[PDB]
C-alpha cells in the first residue's frame, strides 16, 4: 500500500470526535492535531471518517491509539494519505488528510514502520 507520507517525532496536541450528516449520509469522525515541539508544521490535521453502514475500517482501534498517545504526549510517527472527504465544511475544518497509521518513536532518530 501507500505508506510513503508521514511526519516523524510529533506529538498529538489536539483531538476531535463527532457525528455528522452531509449529503444524505451520516458519519462519525475523529481528528488529531499534531505539533513538533511548538513549531506548527505545514500539515497538522489528520482524520478518520466512518460512514455508518460501511464495513469495519479499524476506526475504534485507530481512535484508541490516538487517545493513548494524546494522553501520554509521547513522540510518534503519523502516516497519512489524501482522502478528499465529501462534506465541503468538513474539509474546511480538517483538510483532506486521512490518518492511516500510528507508530511510536523510541528515540529522536528512530520510529517504527515503513520508510
Amino acid at each position: 500500500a501507500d505508506y510513503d507520507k508521514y511526519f516523524s517525532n510529533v506529538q498529538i496536541n489536539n483531538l476531535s470526535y463527532g457525528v455528522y450528516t452531509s449529503g444524505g449520509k451520516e458519519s462519525q469522525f475523529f481528528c488529531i492535531g499534531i505539533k513538533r515541539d511548538n513549531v506548527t508544521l505545514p500539515i497538522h490535521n489528520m482524520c478518520k471518517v466512518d460512514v455508518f453502514g460501511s464495513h469495519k475500517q479499524g476506526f475504534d482501534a485507530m481512535m484508541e491509539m490516538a487517545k493513548y498517545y494524546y494522553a501520554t504526549g509521547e513522540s510518534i510517527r503519523v502516516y497519512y494519505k489524501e482522502n478528499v472527504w465529501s462534506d465541503s465544511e468538513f474539509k474546511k475544518a480538517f483538510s483532506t488528510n486521512e490518518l492511516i497509521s500510528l507508530s511510536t518513536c523510541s528515540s529522536s532518530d528512530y520510529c517504527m514502520g515503513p520508510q
Binding site: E64, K67, Y68, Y70, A71, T72, G73
Partner: protein, 223 residues
C-alpha cells in the same frame, strides 16, 4: 475557612503536639506527585499531602483496617489550611510552560485526590480535632468512633495559598515514570509512610498495604 484532612495511626496526644512533617526538603513536585519522593523511593519530599475529601479519608482507612496485618488504630485529623498550604494546579501551570510535561494519566490521577499540599511542616496548632476511626468486618464498614478536640488548636480565618509553590524544583530530565498508588487510585503520598514516622523502637513494624503503578490501572479503565 479552608479545612483539609489526613489520616494517621499516631494518637491525638502526639500529633496535636508534633503535627505532621515532610520527609525532607525536595521540592521536585512531579517526583512527589508520583509518590516517589514521598513514599516509594528515596523518601525526602518537601510536601505533605492532605485532602479536602471526607470520602477519601474513609477510602484510605479501609486499605489498612481491611487487612489482618494491621494492628494499629487510625484517626482522621482535621486541619486548617493557610498561606503554606498550596493547591497543585497553579504549580502545574508554572511548571508546564517551563517545559515540564504532565501526562493525561497523571492529570487523571491528580484529579482523583482532591489534594492540597503543605510545605515541610504542619504545626499542631492548625489541627482542630481528631476522630478515631472504627473498623467493623461484620459488614466491612468504617465508622466514626470517639471525637477528640485539640485544646492547643489556634482558631483563624485563613485560606489556602492561591499562588505557586515557592522555589519549585524544575527538572532537567523530565520523563514519564511509575505512578505509585494504593487502594482505589489513592496517591501513595497519602499513606502513612507519606510523612516522617516515629522510629525509636527498633523492633517495631507496622502494616503498609499493596502499592501498584497507576499507569496500568488507568490503562485498564480508559479505552
Amino acid at each position: 475557612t479552608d479545612f483539609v484532612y489526613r489520616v494517621d495511626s499516631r494518637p491525638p496526644e502526639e500529633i496535636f503536639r508534633d503535627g505532621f512533617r515532610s520527609h525532607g526538603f525536595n521540592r521536585n513536585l512531579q517526583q512527589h506527585l508520583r509518590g516517589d519522593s514521598c513514599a516509594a523511593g528515596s523518601r525526602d519530599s518537601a510536601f505533605i499531602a492532605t485532602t479536602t475529601s471526607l470520602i477519601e479519608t474513609y477510602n484510605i482507612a479501609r486499605q489498612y483496617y481491611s487487612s489482618s496485618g494491621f494492628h494499629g488504630r487510625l484517626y482522621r485529623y482535621r486541619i486548617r489550611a493557610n498561606n503554606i498550604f498550596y493547591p497543585i494546579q497553579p504549580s502545574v501551570n508554572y511548571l508546564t510552560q517551563r517545559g515540564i510535561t504532565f501526562s493525561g494519566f497523571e492529570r487523571i490521577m491528580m484529579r482523583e485526590q482532591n489534594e492540597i499540599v503543605a510545605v515541610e511542616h504542619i504545626p499542631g496548632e492548625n489541627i482542630v480535632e481528631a476522630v478515631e476511626l472504627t473498623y467493623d468486618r461484620f459488614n466491612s464498614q468504617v465508622s466514626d468512633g470517639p471525637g477528640t478536640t485539640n485544646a492547643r488548636y489556634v482558631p483563624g480565618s485563613t485560606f489556602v495559598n492561591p499562588g505557586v509553590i515557592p522555589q519549585l524544583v524544575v527538572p532537567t530530565v523530565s520523563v514519564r515514570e511509575r505512578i505509585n498508588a494504593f487502594g482505589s487510585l489513592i496517591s501513595a503520598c497519602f499513606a502513612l509512610k507519606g510523612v516522617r514516622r516515629d522510629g525509636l523502637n527498633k523492633r517495631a513494624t507496622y502494616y503498609e498495604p499493596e502499592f501498584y503503578d497507576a499507569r496500568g490501572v488507568l490503562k485498564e479503565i480508559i479505552k
